[PDB]
Amino acid sequence: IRYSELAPLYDTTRLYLVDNKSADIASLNYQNDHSNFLTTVVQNNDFTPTEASTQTINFDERSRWGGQLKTIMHTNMPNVNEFMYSNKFKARVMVSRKQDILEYEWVEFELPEGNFSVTMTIDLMNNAIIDNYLAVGRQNGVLESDIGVKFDTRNFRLGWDPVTELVMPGVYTNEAFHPDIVLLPGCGVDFTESRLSNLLGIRKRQPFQEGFQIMYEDLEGGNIPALLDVDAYEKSKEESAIVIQPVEKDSKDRSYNVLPDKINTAYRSWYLAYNYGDPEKGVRSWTLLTTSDVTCGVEQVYWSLPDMMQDPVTFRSTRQVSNYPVVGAELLPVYSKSFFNEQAVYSQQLRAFTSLTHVFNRFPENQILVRPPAPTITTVSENVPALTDHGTLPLRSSIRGVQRVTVTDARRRTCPYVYKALGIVAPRVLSSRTF
Amino acid sequence: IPANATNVPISIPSRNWAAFRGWSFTRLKTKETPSLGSGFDPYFVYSGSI
Amino acid sequence: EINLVQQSMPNRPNYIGFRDNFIGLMYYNSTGNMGVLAGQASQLNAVVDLQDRNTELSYQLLLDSLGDRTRYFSMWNQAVDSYDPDVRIIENHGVEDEL
Structure with missing residues (x-):
């Protein structure tokens, strides 16, 4: 028989693992989160649930039986989190300046978890470094021309003459062309330990290489051309109806670190290095340039029901937390949905209007060291359920009254930020075996 | 048993x-009885004889 | 001058050791935390734990059946909880203080 308190059933039948038992089985959960939860497979309408979690669903050995897994998962998570390690990035910055003696050290930074736009993420990454000016920058003597790491989106070779490498309008274009690491002399940035690399859209071209630090040395053909001094441009028109000069000045006294025998600033640009730099000796030969993901890439979330069925081949049951079976191997329900704003760059004058605070819009440190104009095309986090059906997994001979359900990521550990994972198993005959 | 219930x-x-035998019964106290089925019972604050 | 008069009463005795037979030092009658005894060519267990089973209790009763629990043993930690019969029921007969 298939149960002793109900009539035996033949052919296809249904079972359910529902996460809606939180008072009928939640005295077994007081350290089991929803990604490791115990829940009944026995759902007797007319029996007390307390005394009915120890009942067993028998399956005769007339034929082998295997359930058909189906999982309905809905996740709500932010895009700055401990899950991806995307709430921290490590960056080499100037940590002291005192005749100048310069110190540099790798200083980890942390973004507050919970965030919305892609544009916001870049801005708070900048603001981390400018809150490290309020730390060791104003308690030493670091110059506001220097900051270590800066993240822009700007392209600095538009309206640019190849023969005379000044930016001829004397200002940089205020349009995004893709994320950029504006990286100072003798400084790197490290994104090995984080997925904030994938947010920028800067990736390795050999991804199984260990380490992922980008040095000032790596960037070649990446020096940012100095602005034309348009004063020299105006007052040469009155002598040709003769002078031309770089903008080395600024009114806050923060000069653009101009390389002395050149018309080029000492600031490097990753974006320039990739495109206009050396083809095989630039930063482009070990990096790739890709579209930004606000989601930071999309992971896989596994299903496991280790003690409720026999596991697929090349697995074995473990109650150890480090290792577990994999079943499904399906997508994370976090996806990216692109949206378009053609006033994207102009809506940073309407967040300037709203917030006169200018600690998000920021005080101009130098006219390179400034927050970047917003991307025209943005990626926006989207949470929609994912439904999936799977093949047969051979079941146990009889099934316990309460059975573990566990979801685990690609790092093989339990997952915060899961609020629905619904097991649906349908037993059916597979093929005859001796009874 | 709630409290002052008779x-x-x-x-x-x-x-x-089928094949039933006797019954036995005894009275415990909520404080002195932990929940077994969970890894930790955070409401158990008693360390005397259970 | 007044803290020359203070009275002190000692702290109450408190004896903290292990349980009667190592009770609840390992999980029985739980799911997720149940043990495994199985082959290495199959993962079918010979452990079935239910919430309506109790084996920590069952073991205590079993020990009593097979011999005295007044005999202490230090290995498996046998030593059954007890009380003095003049604490639980107070036999009182005054004091022989006639001299």
């Missing part, structure tokens, strides 16, 4: 009683 009604669903 009756406990206990009803069991319809079940076979």
